[PDB]
Amino acid sequence: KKIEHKMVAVNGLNMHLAELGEGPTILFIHGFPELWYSWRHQMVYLAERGYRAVAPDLRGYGDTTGAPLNDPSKFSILHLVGDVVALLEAIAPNEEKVFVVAHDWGALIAWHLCLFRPDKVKALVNLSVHFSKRNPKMNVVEGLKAIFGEDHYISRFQVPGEIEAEFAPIGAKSVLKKILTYRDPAPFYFPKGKGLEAIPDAPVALSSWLSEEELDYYANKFEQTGFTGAVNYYRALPINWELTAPWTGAQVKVPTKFIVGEFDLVYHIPGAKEYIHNGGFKKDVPLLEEVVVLEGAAHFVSQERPHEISKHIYDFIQKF
């Protein structure tokens, strides 16, 4: 069978769901600036081994409609987890708990899904983004701006319309190619009026995992939707910080496997490596397995290392 596509009405949205396979449900959750399509390899691998792979486009992404692009406050972590809980109730009505696999912004959603509703998740595979322990002093935007300055991507993303206008003459294809093929451990910089000039290029042979046809899929979709929906997630970071105060000191009680690429910029945020490897991560996530670091890999591991990611998912969920 080929990948099936449907629309599901959830939490004020009409959500696009891609689906492949039969058996126990695995929910895949993409990140920025990606789509359901990022899971193409894993959907096939897991479906051929007796699982039902389900991959939505998130709020403000791809074929999912209903989100007010003009109101970034509606892209809060609470709205996002609300979407996922409602989705699961609709598409998995006979499984109290399901498997969850997620990456980047999807991983951040998955952490909070597990904090808010651990009764819904049997086991979790998170990629790239480690558990974000709430800093009582300041929000993520302010914290990263203090370290990396005004041109840091999360800071430049803040005012609605600004980064959109920067990307406009460049076009979705060039923006996406530059982002998807990025390999340097430093964060993205978007100096005003400089477009993509501040982002270094890696040797071309290192991005052979991304075909022109695959690039075109992302490009065509984001040229239709624009980038506002996706970028609004970062614009909600300040309110996310306020809204998540009730979960200070709370633990994720779901069995978890964490995987990250050696050169992933998120992995190189100051303090991240120490948090992940020296005990802090295990304290917040007591059922965390041994952390997996993919040698020679960068941020987009599901596409860059599809066999390794697929096998790591299969081997982990087989334990249950």
UniProtKB/TrEMBL annotation:
InterPro entries: AB_hydrolase_1 (IPR000073), AB_hydrolase_fold (IPR029058), Epox_hydrolase-like (IPR000639)
Catalytic reaction equation(s): an epoxide + H2O = an ethanediol; (24S)-24,25-epoxycucurbitadienol + H2O = (24R)-24,25-dihydroxycucurbitadienol
Pathway where this protein functions: Secondary metabolite biosynthesis; terpenoid biosynthesis
Residue span, AB hydrolase-1 domain: 24-129
EC number: 3.3.2.10
Enzyme class: hydrolase
MF (Gene Ontology): epoxide hydrolase activity
Entry keywords, A to Z: Hydrolase
Purpose of the protein: Epoxide hydrolase involved in the biosynthesis of cucurbitacin and mogroside tetracyclic triterpene natural products (e.g. siamenoside I and mogrosides IV, V and VI). Cucurbitacins have cytotoxic properties and exhibit deterrent taste as a defense barrier against herbivores. Mogrosides are nonsugar highly oxygenated compounds used as high-intensity zero-calorie sweeteners; they also possess pharmacological properties such as regulating immunity, lowering blood sugar and lipid levels, protecting the liver, and acting as antioxidants and antitumor agents.
Similarity-based family: Belongs to the AB hydrolase superfamily. Epoxide hydrolase family.
Protein name, UniProt field: soluble epoxide hydrolase
Source organism per UniProt: Solanum tuberosum (Potato)
